[PDB]
Amino acid sequence: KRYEKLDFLGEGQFATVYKARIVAIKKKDGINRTALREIKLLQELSHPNIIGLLDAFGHKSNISLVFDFMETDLEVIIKDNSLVLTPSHIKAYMLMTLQGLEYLHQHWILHRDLKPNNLLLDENGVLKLADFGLAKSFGSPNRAYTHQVVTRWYRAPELLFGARMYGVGVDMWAVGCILAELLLRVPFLPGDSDLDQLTRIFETLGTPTEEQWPDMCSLPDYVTFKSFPGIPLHHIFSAAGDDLLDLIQGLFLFNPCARITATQALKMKYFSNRPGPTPGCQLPRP
């Protein structure tokens, strides 16, 4: 092959990743379905905020995917206690995430695995959505989905109630959880199980009612919960301004249809307010 192994970047559920010459190579059923999903989706997508699939090769039943090399991810940024995350840095991260998500959604694809470790950053400060091994196309009624998608701490309540049909709302709720993580530097709703995740969501944001979530009880695993009032948003994010609180509320609307899309979120006044998003070369690095 035309690449020389350089380092060992880590071990995953379905593949191991190496550094090479700079690129990152991710190595009876046949070729692994996660690798095929990544190949088929990233071949049809071309956007600055979506991870670029440079090449793909293999031998027999093993397959390697060659992406661009990513410096870090949002999880390391959030967990790095020595990084001061200014509102401008947060706005820049959200802006790139939402632009990539907007492009992905116009092409009718849901990421379904949005979390800070899946939002990778390069040496130029460009945030790219990665790990499309769970990504799937949406917008067709005859497309069976799995509700057990998205990491639990970022799973949307419609998923946690077992929605097998959903739209961009899953990615938007994960984006709201990521925003809350960036603001609080800790996981927003770190539940230990599905029931605990729902309980934490309702204790922090309030138990939704029929008015906020019109068809709540129609979800297959709808758990009738106690009516907690939920902490007010300004009390949770004490340093969040009114525009940022409006964005958070839109991202955390229990109704997925009313939950703001990537385009709508981009049109919110928060992103066009002072201060502007920091340029990529000024974003904090660990």
């Binding site: 917008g139 009624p141 097998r164 899953v170 068809d215 109704n255 249809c257 992103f271």
Partner: protein
């Protein structure tokens, strides 16, 4: 140093597709199956299916190899 929203510029090489929100007003949604209460609860609406079908119908209709 601010940010201003600009919509994505992608040439579809085809006829104009009506906006997602307008599909109900223009009567398109009368020719797709409505989303079930479970689908609406999950965030799935018939407007999504109608919009994707229209976009695929109009995509690259005028383009030449």
């Amino acid at each position: 140093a601010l940010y201003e929203y600009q919509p994505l510029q992608i040439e579809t090489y085809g006829p104009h597709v009506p906006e997602l929100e307008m599909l109900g007003r223009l009567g398109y949604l009368n020719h797709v199956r409505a989303a079930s209460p479970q689908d609406l609860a999950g965030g799935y609406t018939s407007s999504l299916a109608c919009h994707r079908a229209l976009q695929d119908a109009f995509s690259g209709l005028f383009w030449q190899p």
